[PDB]
Amino acid sequence: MKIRFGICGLGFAGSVLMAPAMRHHPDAQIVAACDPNEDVRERFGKEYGIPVFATLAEMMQHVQMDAVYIASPHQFHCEHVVQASEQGLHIIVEKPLTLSRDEADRMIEAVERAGVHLVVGTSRSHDPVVRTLRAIVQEGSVGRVSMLNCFNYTDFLYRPRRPEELDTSKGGGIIYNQLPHQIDSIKTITGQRITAVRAMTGRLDPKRPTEGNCAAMLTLEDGACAVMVYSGYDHFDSDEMHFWLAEGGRAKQPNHGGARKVLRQLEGDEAELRRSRYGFGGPISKSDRKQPHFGVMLVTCEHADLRASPEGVLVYGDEGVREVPAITGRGPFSQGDTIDELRDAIAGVAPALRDARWGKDTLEVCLAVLESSATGRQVER
Amino acid sequence: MKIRFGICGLGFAGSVLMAPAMRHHPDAQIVAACDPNEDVRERFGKEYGIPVFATLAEMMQHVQMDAVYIASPHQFHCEHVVQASEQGLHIIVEKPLTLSRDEADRMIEAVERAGVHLVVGTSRSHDPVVRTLRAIVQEGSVGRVSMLNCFNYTDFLYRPRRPEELDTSKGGGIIYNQLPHQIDSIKTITGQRITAVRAMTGRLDPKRPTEGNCAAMLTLEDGACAVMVYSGYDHFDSDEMHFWLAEGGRAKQPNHGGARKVLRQLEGDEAELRRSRYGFGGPISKSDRKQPHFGVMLVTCEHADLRASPEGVLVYGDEGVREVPAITGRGPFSQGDTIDELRDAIAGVAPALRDARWGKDTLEVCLAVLESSATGRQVER
Numbered sequence: 001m002k003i004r005f006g007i008c009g010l011g012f013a014g015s016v017l018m019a020p021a022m023r024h025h026p027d028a029q030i031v032a033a034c035d036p037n038e039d040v041r042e043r044f045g046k047e048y049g050i051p052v053f054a055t056l057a058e059m060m061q062h063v064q065m066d067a068v069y070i071a072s073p074h075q076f077h078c079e080h081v082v083q084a085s086e087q088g089l090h091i092i093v094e095k096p097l098t099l100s101r102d103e104a105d106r107m108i109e110a111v112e113r114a115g116v117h118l119v120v121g122t123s124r125s126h127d128p129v130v131r132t133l134r135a136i137v138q139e140g141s142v143g144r145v146s147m148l149n150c151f152n153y154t155d156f157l158y159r160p161r162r163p164e165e166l167d168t169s170k171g172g173g174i175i176y177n178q179l180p181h182q183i184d185s186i187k188t189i190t191g192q193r194i195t196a197v198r199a200m201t202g203r204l205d206p207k208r209p210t211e212g213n214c215a216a217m218l219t220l221e222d223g224a225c226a227v228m229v230y231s232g233y234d235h236f237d238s239d240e241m242h243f244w245l246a247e248g249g250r251a252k253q254p255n256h257g258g259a260r261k262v263l264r265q266l267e268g269d270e271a272e273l274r275r276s277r278y279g280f281g282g283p284i285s286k287s288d289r290k291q292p293h294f295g296v297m298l299v300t301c302e303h304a305d306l307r308a309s310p311e312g313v314l315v316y317g318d319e320g321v322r323e324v325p326a327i328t329g330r331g332p333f334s335q336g337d338t339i340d341e342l343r344d345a346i347a348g349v350a351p352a353l354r355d356a357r358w359g360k361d362t363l364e365v366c367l368a369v370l371e372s373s374a375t376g377r378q379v380e381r
Numbered sequence: 382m383k384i385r386f387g388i389c390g391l392g393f394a395g396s397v398l399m400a401p402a403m404r405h406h407p408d409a410q411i412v413a414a415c416d417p418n419e420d421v422r423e424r425f426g427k428e429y430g431i432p433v434f435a436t437l438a439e440m441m442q443h444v445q446m447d448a449v450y451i452a453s454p455h456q457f458h459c460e461h462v463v464q465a466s467e468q469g470l471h472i473i474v475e476k477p478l479t480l481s482r483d484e485a486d487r488m489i490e491a492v493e494r495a496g497v498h499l500v501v502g503t504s505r506s507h508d509p510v511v512r513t514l515r516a517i518v519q520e521g522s523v524g525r526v527s528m529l530n531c532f533n534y535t536d537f538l539y540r541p542r543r544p545e546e547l548d549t550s551k552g553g554g555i556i557y558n559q560l561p562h563q564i565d566s567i568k569t570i571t572g573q574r575i576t577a578v579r580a581m582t583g584r585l586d587p588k589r590p591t592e593g594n595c596a597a598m599l600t601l602e603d604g605a606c607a608v609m610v611y612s613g614y615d616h617f618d619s620d621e622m623h624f625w626l627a628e629g630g631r632a633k634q635p636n637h638g639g640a641r642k643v644l645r646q647l648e649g650d651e652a653e654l655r656r657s658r659y660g661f662g663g664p665i666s667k668s669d670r671k672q673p674h675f676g677v678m679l680v681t682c683e684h685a686d687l688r689a690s691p692e693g694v695l696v697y698g699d700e701g702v703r704e705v706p707a708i709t710g711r712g713p714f715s716q717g718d719t720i721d722e723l724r725d726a727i728a729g730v731a732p733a734l735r736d737a738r739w740g741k742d743t744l745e746v747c748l749a750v751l752e753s754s755a756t757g758r759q760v761e762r
Binding site for chain 2: 205
């Protein structure tokens with residue numbers, strides 16, 4: 001029925017992506033928020049008409065709530081998840097889940113012993129086009145998946161960043177912040193375990209020395225494979241091969257120089273541009289759109305190739321093309337579907353797919369990309 | 382200067398692709414032809430005004446010539462190559478080179494002991510867009526190649542075929558008839574040896590049980606990798622992601638049912654449709670075009686992504702996009718460039734790149750795709 005949510009961590013994912021989508025979602029009410037930053041917290045409390053807090057602990061002591069949406073920096077996810085679990089609160093947590101397998105185990109153990117439901121965390125696998133691709137595959141007519149092909153060329157590395165985000169050791173770069181979207185989509189579309197990983201990564205800019213590109217072949221469990229390719233250097237832009245839609249569904253304008261131009265001319269400190277542009281009540285808090293997507297994703301089955309469209313899925317069949325509209329979610333497009341997955345779990349309609357074990361599993365696939373790329377070898381798991 | 386050519390084997394590659402391109406090529410004169418089929422041979426002799434013959438041996442005994450273009454069925458390539466070599470004639474040979482490593486060794490040994498030049502055989506790597514991509518890479522400004530991404534979705538399996546062409550054991554299917562175009566392009570663009578192969582193949586149609594799709598990751602020798610994906614089931618059509626140009630440069634019209642429709646309604650025997658449509662003086666002998674291409678090919682370097690265009694190469698740089706026209710060849714687009722590579726070799730301007738050893742090497746990479754796909758393992762070579 002109606003889930004009373006607290007938001008924990010009010011950076012970009014929290015305040016600007018998820019929060020408005022929650023207001024607008026009919027099965028969800030924002031009831032409270034916390035963040036370490038007194039400034040942002042207070043502004044957010046005024047605009048949404050809710051009490052706010054400096055720590056999760058305090059929010060849990062002072063507001064009747066059913067779930068927490070945890071959008072704190074990843075280094076805080078483990079303890080935030082344990083803490084919510086110990087209160088019997090259900091959870092949505094942003095990616096990265098964690099960087100650490102041990103953490104991931106502590107999270108699983110806490111959630112399971114508490115009996116709560118957890119979902120992670122607005123992936124692009126919540127995109128209805130990806131859910132639609134799954135429905136088409138299970139439905140059966142299209143036949144078995146033989147292979148998938150996903151690629152996304154992007155300007156990610158040249159968006160405004162804090163300097164810890166350009167250190168893979170601290171969680172930066174595309175392995176932890178982008179590849180999970182493809183990996184989760186591949187798992188979602190196929191319903192198969194990833195059993196082997198061959199990947200190569202590059203860090204083609206030494207001024208920003210984290211991973212910006214990757215080429216990978218993922219072996220799935222029935223012998224099907226998925227190729228996954230990602231590059232973030234703001235060179236090719238693959239929305240050209242996806243109807244010139246942006247990732248978030250709104251039409252895109254070519255801007256190839258784009259993010260790199262903005263940074264070169266920038267006078268001052270980039271970290272500031274980051275928090276002033278993507279913070280709460282900054283520019284991008286200003287948001288007739290089509291389906292969201294992540295690069296292009298070509299699923300080749302026995303009786304068809306499948307591809308995400310602005311409205312649903314393009315099915316290239318034996319007979320020629322036809323279109324399938326995207327499965328209606330109850331609220332907004334990705335963000336809303338994340339909420340639906342939890343509601344469904346709490347309601348006993350459907351247990352969560354993207355639980356803590358699925359998260360750990362995606363973390364392991366990321367680690368296997370790092371290993372395969374260091375050693376040159378396909379990594380079995 | 383002017384190369385006097387004999388054409389040996391007058392099926393589609395010989396009579397309809399290469400022959401007109403040779404007339405039109407200024408450094409080349411067709412001087413004679415052979416083919417086992419009295420009918421086709423004679424028709425061809427009338428139209429090109431040349432003497433014709435039932436066997437290579439006879440042609441070599443009766444016409445002063447400098448080179449042979451060998452477009453016989455692949456099972457005949459070995460002996461055709463040995464025979465020409467033993468006469469001191471230079472050679473262009475169509476792919477497949479051979480299916481057999483031993484054959485490939487006999488071919489190398491004959492060519493080398495005779496001192497003749499050999500090129501194989503009109504690959505899509507002779508496409509000037511591919512040569513242009515190479516020039517850009519060697520030129521250096523764009524920086525090192527980190528990874529390549531090539532894909533082509535096609536209707537190959539449902540074009541009209543003789544029944545031996547739907548038996549991998551006899552040389553059919555995409556491993557020997559399509560993948561070499563990508564493999565050769567990858568080698569040409571990068572100038573690197575392929576040192577490992579992870580691939581999966583499918584035969585998604587049991588009525589036509591040869592390989593129709595493949596997903597592969599090719600490891601190159603400096604650590605760069607190339608992803609290669611191919612599907613031929615007439616479902617998705619990737620010319621959509623290449624400006625709706627066909628492979629051969631002429632604008633394309635969507636026809637997704639296309640080749641499969643033609644076959645389903647076909648009354649009679651498919652082998653007949655094959656030789657009556659693609660034979661000499663059939664329909665497709667009827668041939669203002671742009672650059673040829675093979676699916677799309679995205680080369681991601683340190684300072685740019687590169688992509689083939691209808692006019693040359695699209696360079697997505699730090700600064701934004703710019704276009705480089707395709708290196709002018711001396712004659713027509715792919716076919717002509719194949720001739721230039723031999724002329725250059727005979728003239729002492731540049732030895733051939735695509736010699737018999739390069740061919741064997743491509744054959745080994747194809748074999749490694751077959752092995753990797755049977756075993757699930759990356760194959761080192």
